[PDB]
């Protein structure tokens, strides 16, 4: 309830700021002023053309490493279990495999960007 | 299928313990030390019947014993207890840690006036025995009669008559 009111207040304040910024000043837009910005001249191609991604392999690994966070965040609560020896074995197992996966991608030159 | 039987309102009338949660938390340790027997009888009733309708008298006894406990506190010293529960009421988590002096004064009063000893750590959490005349319920789950199982596999194994008996095979 209060978080909804807070979010609404923040979004409304930002929107009113945009509205003020767009309706208070004197607008004079003509074709040359709104043209795309290159440093001095006109662009050759488009900004919508494909832009090659040299770290594409690290990005996919980020998805798999991100989900290893969902497995480790309940660890503060798991420390309150009675049988700590099986919990600590499983928590360390979950991090050794995460370390071994990082080591594997490192040694196979997976962490290097495409040249 | 069937009518749910509910108690009448006059069966649900008792004198209420109308002190706030801070007063209750300030009193909790001594209250558990003194009012243990009715509370344990009520909770044994509660986990043995699995029905709020079958343990109303035990709950009324719980209320009565708690009211007498608070009456004793009110009769012998109310000032140190008021200070203690004012502490407890101020903090948002009702932490015991935030005044041990007022708790000390309350403990001294209840010890040198009523002879009450505050329970130590690990005592109120013990599982205790309770002696009741209430008969153990025969079937609290209201279970039906379980269906009769398949009888058994009895006898000695003998070779199949004329073997497999599949089409032309003779074994």
């Amino acid at each position: 309830m209060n978080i909804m009111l807070t979010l609404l207040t923040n979004v409304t304040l930002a929107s009113l700021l945009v509205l003020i910024a767009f309706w208070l000043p004197q607008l004079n837009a003509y074709s040359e002023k709104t043209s795309p910005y290159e440093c001095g001249f006109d662009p050759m191609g488009s900004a919508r053309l494909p832009f090659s991604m040299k770290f594409f392999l690290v990005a996919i690994t980020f998805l798999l490493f991100d989900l290893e966070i969902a497995l480790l965040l309940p660890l503060p609560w798991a420390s309150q279990t009675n049988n700590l020896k099986t919990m600590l074995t499983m928590a360390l197992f979950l991090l050794i495999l995460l370390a071994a996966s990082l080591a594997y991608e490192w040694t196979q030159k997976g962490l290097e960007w495409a040249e | 299928p069937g009518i749910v039987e509910l108690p009448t309102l006059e069966d649900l009338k008792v004198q209420e313990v109308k002190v706030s949660s801070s007063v209750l938390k300030a009193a909790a340790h001594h209250y558990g030390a003194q009012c243990d027997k009715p509370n344990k009888e009520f909770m044994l009733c509660r986990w043995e019947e699995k029905d709020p309708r079958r343990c109303l008298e035990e709950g009324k006894l719980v209320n009565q014993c708690a009211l007498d406990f608070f009456r004793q506190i009110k009769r012998h010293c109310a000032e140190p207890f008021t200070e203690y529960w004012t502490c407890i009421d101020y903090s948002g988590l009702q932490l015991f840690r935030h005044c041990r002096k007022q708790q000390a004064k309350f403990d001294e009063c209840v010890l040198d006036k009523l002879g009450w000893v505050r329970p130590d750590l690990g005592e109120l959490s013990k599982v205790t025995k309770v002696k009741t005349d209430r008969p153990l319920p025969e079937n609290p789950y209201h279970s039906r009669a379980r269906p009769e199982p398949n009888p058994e596999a009895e006898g000695d194994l003998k070779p199949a008559k004329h073997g497999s008996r599949l089409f032309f095979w003779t074994m």
Binding site: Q80, T81, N82, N83, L84, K85, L88, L92, I96, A99 | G32, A33, D36, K37, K40, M43, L44, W47, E48, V117, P119, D120, L121, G122, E123, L124, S125, K126, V127, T128, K129, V130, K131, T132, L136
Partner: protein
């Protein structure tokens, strides 16, 4: 045992971060099995009363079950107060 010294020397000269990481991870793996305080941690976890202790029906054959919380029977937490 002689070449491993030179291997560790080279690693410490070139990759101190990896050496530190492996030493810390190995210590974290092995030390808990050699500690006498992990049993204390387990028993502390076991002594936290999250749930209500349901009383037992008295049948007359329970010499080790208390009749009252302040009775001498039952578990003791004096080891925790001094810990």
């Amino acid at each position: 045992a002689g070449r491993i010294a030179s291997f560790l020397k080279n690693a410490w000269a070139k990759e101190p971060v990896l050496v530190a990481s492996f030493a810390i991870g190995g210590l974290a793996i092995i030390l808990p099995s050699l500690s006498p305080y992990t049993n204390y941690a387990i028993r502390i976890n076991r002594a936290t009363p999250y749930n209500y202790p349901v009383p037992l029906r008295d049948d007359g054959n329970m010499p080790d079950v208390p009749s009252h919380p302040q009775d001498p029977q039952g578990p003791s937490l004096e080891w925790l107060k001094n810990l």
